[PDB]
């Protein structure tokens, strides 16, 4: 608890440092009245913004590269599909529940479980498998095929965790299981691009996991820290570096609740990974 006590003081000073001021030059700003941010206080670092009209961030913790973003507002589903397709997305992991998506006061379009046209893009959706992850959590798998005229059709694998509640932490075991299922999905898809000579394969602002929830700072950040602890390449990287990297690169809220951080602390503990630096 002492080590845990010190990890929290350090992470809590950083949250306060990073709190967005009014017209903060560190955070990406809304343009010309179109709304950017689904929650006015969950801002996007401008230095790592993926595009100018999405609250979306390139993240890199250690060697593990991903894109973390909020749930697109309606205004944004054409750009959100544009980003999915230009990234040659190897896997989209969607962590907002069906209840959340279904409740229309929440403004969460059900963009991937049905077909649609969104400006010049047309997307087709198809349910393929349903994997159980443990403790009752379930992933339903979809394939989104994204087509826009005069452009190369792209197809994205979707893992949707249908029943993970906002503000909660699923267990170490559902997390471990989830992180593996999203990395393996990513891998089959990346190996498909590589057998075809994709130029995306060279480029390291492409072929990144896109993970989001609602705000994309809680359930999104707990999955991301477990994907990062799963790469042998991220040896000795403490939990304090990992959360600090996530927060300097998107916003200081990443790993929002203390229950989500404790799941990352027990996964650390079991690998014999450090909490604190030095």
Swiss-Prot record:
Induction: At 37 degrees Celsius in the absence of calcium. Residues 1-271 form the Tyrosine-protein phosphatase domain. Keywords: Hydrolase, Plasmid, Protein phosphatase, Secreted, Virulence. The keyword Secreted applies. It is found in: Secreted. Its EC number is 3.1.3.48. GO terms for molecular function: protein tyrosine phosphatase activity. The keyword Secreted applies. Its main location: secreted. It catalyses: O-phospho-L-tyrosyl-[protein] + H2O = L-tyrosyl-[protein] + phosphate. GO terms for cellular component: extracellular region. Coiled coil: none annotated. It comes from the Bacteria. Monomer. Essential virulence determinant. This protein is a protein tyrosine phosphatase. The essential function of YopH in Yersinia pathogenesis is host-protein dephosphorylation. It contributes to the ability of the bacteria to resist phagocytosis by peritoneal macrophages. Belongs to the protein-tyrosine phosphatase family. Non-receptor class subfamily. This is Tyrosine-protein phosphatase YopH.
């Amino acid at each position: 608890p002492e080590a845990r006590a010190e990890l929290s003081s350090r992470l809590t000073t950083l949250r306060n440092t990073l709190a967005p001021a009014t017209n903060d030059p560190r955070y990406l700003q809304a343009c010309g009245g179109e709304k950017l941010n689904r929650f006015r206080d969950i801002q996007c670092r401008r230095q790592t913004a993926v595009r100018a009209d999405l609250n979306a961030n390139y993240i890199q913790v250690g060697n593990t590269r991903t894109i973390a973003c909020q749930y697109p507002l309606q205004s944004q589903l054409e750009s959100h599909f544009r980003m999915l397709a230009e990234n040659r997305t190897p896997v989209l992991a969607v962590l907002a529940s069906s209840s959340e998506i279904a409740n229309q006061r929440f403004g969460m379009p059900d963009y991937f479980r049905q077909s649609g046209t969104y400006g010049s893009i047309t997307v087709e959706s198809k349910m393929t498998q349903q994997v159980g992850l443990g403790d009752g959590i379930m992933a339903d798998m979809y394939t989104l095929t994204i087509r826009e005229a005069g452009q190369k059709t792209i197809s994205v694998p979707v893992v949707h965790v249908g029943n993970w509640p906002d503000q909660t932490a699923v267990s170490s075991e559902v997390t471990k299981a989830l992180a593996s299922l999203v990395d393996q999905t990513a891998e089959t898809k990346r190996n498909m691009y590589e057998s075809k000579g994709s130029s995306a394969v060279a480029d390291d602002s492409k072929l990144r996991p896109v993970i989001h929830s609602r705000a994309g700072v809680g359930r999104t950040a707990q999955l991301i820290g477990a994907m990062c602890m799963n790469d042998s390449r991220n040896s000795q990287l403490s939990v304090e570096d990992m959360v600090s990297q996530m927060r300097v690169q998107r916003n200081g809220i990443m790993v929002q609740k203390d229950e989500q951080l404790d799941v990352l602390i027990k996964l650390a503990e079991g690998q014999g990974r450090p909490l604190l630096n030095s």
